[PDB]
Amino acid sequence: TRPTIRPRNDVVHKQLSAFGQYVAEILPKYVQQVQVSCFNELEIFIHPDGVIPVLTFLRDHTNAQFKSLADLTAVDVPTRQNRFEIVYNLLSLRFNSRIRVKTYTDELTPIESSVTVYKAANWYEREIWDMFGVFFANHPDLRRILTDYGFEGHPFRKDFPLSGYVELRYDDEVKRVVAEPVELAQEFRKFDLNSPWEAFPAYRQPPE
Amino acid sequence: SNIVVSTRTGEVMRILPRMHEDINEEWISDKTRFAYDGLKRQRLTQPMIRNEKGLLTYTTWEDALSRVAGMLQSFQGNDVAAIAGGLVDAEALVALKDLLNRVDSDSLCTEEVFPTAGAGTDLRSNYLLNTTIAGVEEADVILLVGTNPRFEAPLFNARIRKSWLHNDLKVALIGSPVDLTYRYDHLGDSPKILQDIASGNHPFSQILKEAKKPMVVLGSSALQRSDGTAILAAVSNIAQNIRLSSGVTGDWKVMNILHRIASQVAALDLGYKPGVEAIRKNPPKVLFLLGADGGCITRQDLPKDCFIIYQGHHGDVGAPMADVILPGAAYTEKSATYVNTEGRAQQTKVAVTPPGLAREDWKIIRALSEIAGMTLPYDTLDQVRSRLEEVSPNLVRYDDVEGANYFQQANELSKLVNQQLLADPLVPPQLTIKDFYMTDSISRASQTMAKCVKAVTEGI
Amino acid sequence: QLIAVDEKLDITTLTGVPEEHIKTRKVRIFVPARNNMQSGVNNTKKWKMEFDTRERWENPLMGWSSTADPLSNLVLTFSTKEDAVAFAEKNGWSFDVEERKVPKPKSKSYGANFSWNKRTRVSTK
Amino acid sequence: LGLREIRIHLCQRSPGSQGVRDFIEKRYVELKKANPDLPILIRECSDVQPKLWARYAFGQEKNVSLNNFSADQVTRTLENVLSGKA
Amino acid sequence: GTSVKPIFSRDMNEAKRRVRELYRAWYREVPNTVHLFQLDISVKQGRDKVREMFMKNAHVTDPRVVDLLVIKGKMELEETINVWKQRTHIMRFFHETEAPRPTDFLSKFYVGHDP
Amino acid sequence: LHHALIPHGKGGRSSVSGIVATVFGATGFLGRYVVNHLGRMGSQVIVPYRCEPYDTMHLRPMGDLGQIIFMEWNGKDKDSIRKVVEHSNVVINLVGREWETKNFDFEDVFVKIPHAIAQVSKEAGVEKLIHISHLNADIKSPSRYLRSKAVGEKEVRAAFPEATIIKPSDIFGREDRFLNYFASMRLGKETVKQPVYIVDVSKGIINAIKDPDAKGKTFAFVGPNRYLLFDLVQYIFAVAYRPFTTRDKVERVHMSDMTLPHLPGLEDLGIQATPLELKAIEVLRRHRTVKPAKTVN
Amino acid sequence: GVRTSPTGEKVTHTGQAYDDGDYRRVRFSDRQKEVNENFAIDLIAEQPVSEVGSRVISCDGGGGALGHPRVYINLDKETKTGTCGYCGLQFRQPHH
Numbered sequence A: 001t002r003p004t005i006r007p008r009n010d011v012v013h014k015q016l017s018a019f020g021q022y023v024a025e026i027l028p029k030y031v032q033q034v035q036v037s038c039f040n041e042l043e044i045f046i047h048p049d050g051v052i053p054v055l056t057f058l059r060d061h062t063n064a065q066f067k068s069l070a071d072l073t074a075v076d077v078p079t080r081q082n083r084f085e086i087v088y089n090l091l092s093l094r095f096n097s098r099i100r101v102k103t104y105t106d107e108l109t110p111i112e113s114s115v116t117v118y119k120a121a122n123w124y125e126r127e128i129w130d131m132f133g134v135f136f137a138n139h140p141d142l143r144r145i146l147t148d149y150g151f152e153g154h155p156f157r158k159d160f161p162l163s164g165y166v167e168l169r170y171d172d173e174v175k176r177v178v179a180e181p182v183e184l185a186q187e188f189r190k191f192d193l194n195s196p197w198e199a200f201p202a203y204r205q206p207p208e
Numbered sequence B: 001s002n003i004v005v006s007t008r009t010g011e012v013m014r015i016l017p018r019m020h021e022d023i024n025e026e027w028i029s030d031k032t033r034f035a036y037d038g039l040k041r042q043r044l045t046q047p048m049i050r051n052e053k054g055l056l057t058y059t060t061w062e063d064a065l066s067r068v069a070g071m072l073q074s075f076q077g078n079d080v081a082a083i084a085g086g087l088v089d090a091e092a093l094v095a096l097k098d099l100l101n102r103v104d105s106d107s108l109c110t111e112e113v114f115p116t117a118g119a120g121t122d123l124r125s126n127y128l129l130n131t132t133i134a135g136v137e138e139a140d141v142i143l144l145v146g147t148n149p150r151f152e153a154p155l156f157n158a159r160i161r162k163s164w165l166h167n168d169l170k171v172a173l174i175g176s177p178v179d180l181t182y183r184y185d186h187l188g189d190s191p192k193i194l195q196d197i198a199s200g201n202h203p204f205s206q207i208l209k210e211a212k213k214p215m216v217v218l219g220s221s222a223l224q225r226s227d228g229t230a231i232l233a234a235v236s237n238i239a240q241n242i243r244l245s246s247g248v249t250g251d252w253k254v255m256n257i258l259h260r261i262a263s264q265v266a267a268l269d270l271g272y273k274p275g276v277e278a279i280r281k282n283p284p285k286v287l288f289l290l291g292a293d294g295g296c297i298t299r300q301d302l303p304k305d306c307f308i309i310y311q312g313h314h315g316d317v318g319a320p321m322a323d324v325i326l327p328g329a330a331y332t333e334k335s336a337t338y339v340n341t342e343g344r345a346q347q348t349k350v351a352v353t354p355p356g357l358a359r360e361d362w363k364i365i366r367a368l369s370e371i372a373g374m375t376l377p378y379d380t381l382d383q384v385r386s387r388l389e390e391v392s393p394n395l396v397r398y399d400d401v402e403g404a405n406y407f408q409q410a411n412e413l414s415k416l417v418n419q420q421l422l423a424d425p426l427v428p429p430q431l432t433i434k435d436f437y438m439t440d441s442i443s444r445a446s447q448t449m450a451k452c453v454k455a456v457t458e459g460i
Numbered sequence C: 001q002l003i004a005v006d007e008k009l010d011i012t013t014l015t016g017v018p019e020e021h022i023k024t025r026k027v028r029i030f031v032p033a034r035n036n037m038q039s040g041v042n043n044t045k046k047w048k049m050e051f052d053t054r055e056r057w058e059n060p061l062m063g064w065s066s067t068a069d070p071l072s073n074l075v076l077t078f079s080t081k082e083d084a085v086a087f088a089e090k091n092g093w094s095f096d097v098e099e100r101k102v103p104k105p106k107s108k109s110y111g112a113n114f115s116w117n118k119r120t121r122v123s124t125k
Numbered sequence D: 001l002g003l004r005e006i007r008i009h010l011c012q013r014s015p016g017s018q019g020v021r022d023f024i025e026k027r028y029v030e031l032k033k034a035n036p037d038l039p040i041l042i043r044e045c046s047d048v049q050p051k052l053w054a055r056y057a058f059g060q061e062k063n064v065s066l067n068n069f070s071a072d073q074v075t076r077t078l079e080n081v082l083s084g085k086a
Numbered sequence E: 001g002t003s004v005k006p007i008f009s010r011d012m013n014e015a016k017r018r019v020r021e022l023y024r025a026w027y028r029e030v031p032n033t034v035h036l037f038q039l040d041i042s043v044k045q046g047r048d049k050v051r052e053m054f055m056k057n058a059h060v061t062d063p064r065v066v067d068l069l070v071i072k073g074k075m076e077l078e079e080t081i082n083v084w085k086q087r088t089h090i091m092r093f094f095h096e097t098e099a100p101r102p103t104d105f106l107s108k109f110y111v112g113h114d115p
Numbered sequence F: 001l002h003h004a005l006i007p008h009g010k011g012g013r014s015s016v017s018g019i020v021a022t023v024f025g026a027t028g029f030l031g032r033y034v035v036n037h038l039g040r041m042g043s044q045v046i047v048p049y050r051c052e053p054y055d056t057m058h059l060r061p062m063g064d065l066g067q068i069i070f071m072e073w074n075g076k077d078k079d080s081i082r083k084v085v086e087h088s089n090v091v092i093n094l095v096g097r098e099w100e101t102k103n104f105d106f107e108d109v110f111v112k113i114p115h116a117i118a119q120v121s122k123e124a125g126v127e128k129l130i131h132i133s134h135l136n137a138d139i140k141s142p143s144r145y146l147r148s149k150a151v152g153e154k155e156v157r158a159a160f161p162e163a164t165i166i167k168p169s170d171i172f173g174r175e176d177r178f179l180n181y182f183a184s185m186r187l188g189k190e191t192v193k194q195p196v197y198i199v200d201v202s203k204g205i206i207n208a209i210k211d212p213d214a215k216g217k218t219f220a221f222v223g224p225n226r227y228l229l230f231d232l233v234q235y236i237f238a239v240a241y242r243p244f245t246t247r248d249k250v251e252r253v254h255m256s257d258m259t260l261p262h263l264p265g266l267e268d269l270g271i272q273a274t275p276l277e278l279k280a281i282e283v284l285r286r287h288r289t290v291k292p293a294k295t296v297n
Numbered sequence G: 001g002v003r004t005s006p007t008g009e010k011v012t013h014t015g016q017a018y019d020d021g022d023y024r025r026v027r028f029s030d031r032q033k034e035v036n037e038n039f040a041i042d043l044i045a046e047q048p049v050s051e052v053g054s055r056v057i058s059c060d061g062g063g064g065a066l067g068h069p070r071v072y073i074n075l076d077k078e079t080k081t082g083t084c085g086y087c088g089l090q091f092r093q094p095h096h
Ligand SMILES: NC(=O)C1=CN([C@@H]2O[C@H](COP(=O)(O)OP(=O)(O)OC[C@H]3O[C@@H](n4cnc5c(N)ncnc54)[C@H](OP(=O)(O)O)[C@@H]3O)[C@@H](O)[C@H]2O)C=CC1
Pocket: F024, F025, F026, F027, F028, F029, F030, F031, F049, F050, F051, F075, F093, F094, F095, F096, F097, F098, F104, F109, F132, F133, F134, F135, F168, F169, F170, F171, F172, F176, F177, F178
């Protein structure tokens, strides 16, 4: 390991593994998997029905007390049956640690809103509904937060076009800003950058 | 052969091969790779009609369509006819078939001639490469009559060469002694040799008798000559002797026919009459040239003040002799169906869009039908392909090559008429490499093929 | 607690796509062919969904390439064919599927080069 | 009123096409003996009922199913179509 | 099987009830909006547009899809009540500035390559 | 047909319509709408302007990049007209003035300038020329305005045989001088008026450019209804919630609108004329702080 | 070496010039057309051919790291002169 390689920490790796096993033991009803990254990041995969309990536990337990919600986001993977992946990032100031909770959903199944647990989630959840179309149940006010009023479609889905469907201009006939089907003077050049000759043998998949 | 068209900002950049283990292995011929230069020259972009001076001038789509529809409505019967070129798709073929049927015409012809005597194009196995390209690798002897596969089907000849090198295939030829990149046994040039093979006097009959899996291939070049039906009868007799004497090995399918143009098999499957003899016997007064650039029919052998319609993409020998010109799309510009010499149907994809006012061929014919009042049922591409499935359901299966064997029926239907063989050697048009670079309108329009011809004729 | 409804999934009304870009477009589901310029095969592992080519024209100013459809650069990646077909049906797109092409195994042998009586005898090396 | 062509769509491996298959293998040639100028197209289906299409003058077409028909049955059907009786 | 988690309704009757509620709310809002944003349309034209926007989704047979559509519709209704939207947004429903795209085969054949 | 003149795209802002239009008098009431309709479909517009560029500043957003080119010209000069119409395949004449000026009287505005434009367009190889003149334009008119209009019609017909003449009557628009003129007055019962919407005239001009057989025809663009002047002014004052230019304009507005049933109208161009009541609120909403007028047919 | 078009326009180093019937010329009227006067092809045509007595020469474009990537040019073909792929300079062995 030369100065060009990021050094490994083993103490934190073991600590995170032990705490992940601890959380798994306490909550066997919801926890489906626990992983620790090679760079000491602990992530927990749970059933969607356990968002309110597990988070509450992590917020309220004496050993955990993850009091801060750093971020709440969603990841779109169209090849999965449950399209959307809801990610909760939590920070514990008492133990100076970070955790990640991961959940799955689809276009029609809603997710319970964690506003009752973390207030910070409120706006975050709105953003998810705006950008991926994931519905959050029992939300104080769920509406668009980023897109234009009356915007049709959820732009952060992997099948939404990059340039959208409509574009805005001004019309002097009607004396107002109008929306028309999008037409680009220069179409976006699509570059095929993926190369053959795979780079990382550590991530090779079986040839089924 | 499968290809990949590489484009960039709506312009064809290059052509690359595509791996198909059963058709083109991994490669393509030089013409396929380097003839895309011809898609940018001598292009038809707008409709044209004759002006008062008798010259061709540009016009709108409505004017040209109305001018064609007036003559279509005025005439009827055998006075209306069409010829299909060598670069036409199944969609336009069935479209024009239906259009001329609605006016009660059956003069649907192709430039290449296939003998209609006996079974004709009624049995699919009567005009296909039944052994298939991937099946060439299982043969132990092979006989080639009246063909030069090196320039007539380069990938077929490459497969024969591979089987010759690896499977110790034995190759024999009847025709001119051309070079095939591998050594073969030259029986002769006269068609009479074929008869000897049927009689058993010629020792190659005995050599082929012991073959476990014999293959016989007859090229369309030998069928283009006036004695083609007699040649096909002789080759069918040879195959009959093979099956009855040496025994039926099973589903081997010895009889094979190798074609030269991509539009022939689909037209034969769609009921088109091969050859232009129907046009010659009953000259029409309005004629459709669906990309017809073979030069077979001139204005000399048509009635005076005949009406000629050319619909294609390139300006070639067939365009200036027309009265109304409709610009069509090329194979790089439309999703179109082509059936290869094996009988396998494959569809192209849209790489770029047709230039100027050019449209899709079947769309042009459908619009013409709507203007003339004989409106056709189909409106979209899927409806055209449903019509294709109605006429011939195997034109919508895009990777199947298998088919039933009807050799016995066509064989005993071929034994009725006995035309004598001519005393002319079987000389194919593709004698030398210089004759291979320019064969169709796309090739003749390219500087690359002109450079190839100039380099072949004289080299530094 | 459970509807137990029996109907095919269809989220067409919720995606915000214009009506013309649904019943007219034709997606293609395929494994991309290997680039014959290279011998690597790492780009032929996944399935791709791509839309049909529409009209591109030249800009009167600067001569750039202008387009009008939004789905020109949209290519989706899927693990298996069934996943891609399910996605296409759920989104209400007509699709064409052609099966994966795998290179058949071949009997390679160096000693076949130096053959006593067969034709695999190489002229040089 | 004038017959222009007929097309027989039969399947290769389906048992419901078997009789139709037999018809060809036994009498198709003889039918061509009676009809030297009528194009008798035979084509291949796949999981589709065998069918007979008659295309008359001016593009008028009429189809009849041949599923599970016997060889004598299809012989009679083709005779009926060729003779013009209905 | 095919058992799924509900959103608001369990079967089609409750979804239809919610659709009727939303339609009543939009119908009552139309003239107030027409007056408030100082529109150029009439109230009959606005209610016809509301009817058309409802009839566009008349082919849905999934209670989950229907009630999610209803959730969305209440969202735009709430946008319109509170005048979050400008005058331009309300019009975006009428496509007044767009050229009429013909549908017959001959017109599409003449205008361009678009199928 | 000069391939670069072939339509391309989907008829949007960045598309190509194959129309290269020179719109004389494009800084006016009708010019802005004509340029807007020409630019929203992707056509290239040459705007020849006499005034300062500041007054042409509003035309720029109407087209995409490079689709509108502004050029100086003089009506008295032929070289400027020549160089403005050198490369156009469509020329539209919208030059008009409703009053007298010490440099331009009615004869130069309505006779000499259109004659020069038509002659230069013919000598330059322009395919289509469109000319606009009043509906009530007759030689025997009392007013010099409409007499000059009629002389200009005859002269442009002589110079450009394939010229299309349009005879709109009393166009009313947001920036017009018909509804605003009456609303700024803050005599009739025998005079009849037949006003036509601005957008209808714009679409008529566009279709006439597109229409292939509208070469030498003469059109009369009129509205759906004929209005007595008194009740029309009453309705104008009622819509604005209001209680109820030297010599030529009052004479013109006292004249009745002619009826020319033999000439084709907007219906020939596939346009449904918009009634005045629908757009009266749009025009007159800005003159503030229901019972439409009765019509005669 | 800047040529003039038959219409009167200037032809760029790429050979670009609007023909008689092209409408786009209107963009240049009352304005100017931007053409670079210095043609790289003519300027590189007049360079002298360097004489070196080695079978293989090296070219980096001059300036060291301020030029182009270093390349090696073979001079065995006495028929022609070896040309740098980047710089366009020419090299040739002292025949006779
Ligand atoms: N109610 C109406 O307005 C209808 C109009 N008429 C006809 O329709 C045409 C256009 O109408 P409209 O747009 O309302 O008129 P405008 O008053 O709005 O302006 C007409 C255009 O012509 C130009 N122009 C006027 N006089 C001269 C001149 N002496 N020299 C050069 N350019 C000049 C003006 O440019 P600049 O800014 O430099 O002055 C102006 O851009 C006119 O020919 C008119 O006669 C048809 C029926 C009635």
